[PDB]
């Protein structure tokens, strides 16, 4: 009980946890949770796009 250990988990629970984390992170920096727009994700995707763009140029150079 109490969720101790390393038991398996459902994909619904994975996004469930990940949602509560985003909401709490927003509370520490913006002191509000209305979240009319969610800038937390938008700022993260721009980083993922930069890393992905860099790797694509490496594949191009490796293929050359």
């Amino acid at each position: 009980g109490s969720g101790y250990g390393l038991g398996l988990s459902t994909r619904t629970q994975v996004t469930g946890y990940q949602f509560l984390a985003r909401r709490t992170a927003m509370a520490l920096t913006r002191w509000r949770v209305r979240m009319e727009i969610e800038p937390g994700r938008r700022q993260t995707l721009a980083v993922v796009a930069s890393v992905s763009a860099a790797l694509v140029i490496c594949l191009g150079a490796l293929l050359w």
């Binding site: 969720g3 101790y4 250990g5 390393l6 398996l8 988990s9 994909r11 994975v14």
Partner: protein
């Protein structure tokens, strides 16, 4: 390290994202066995130099 993990894992809590991550390690380990064993048996070089 095994004894250390054996003593601490049963009384701690881990979030769903980490439990899902330890699960996928098994599948990531199974997939490379066949491609690697055939490489060790030299099959890819044997066929390419038929």
């Amino acid at each position: 390290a095994g004894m250390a993990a054996a003593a601490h894992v049963p009384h701690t809590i881990y979030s769903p994202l980490f439990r899902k991550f330890v699960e996928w390690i098994e599948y990531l380990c199974l997939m490379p066995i066949f491609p690697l064993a055939l490489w060790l048996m030299n099959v890819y070089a044997a066929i390419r130099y038929r």
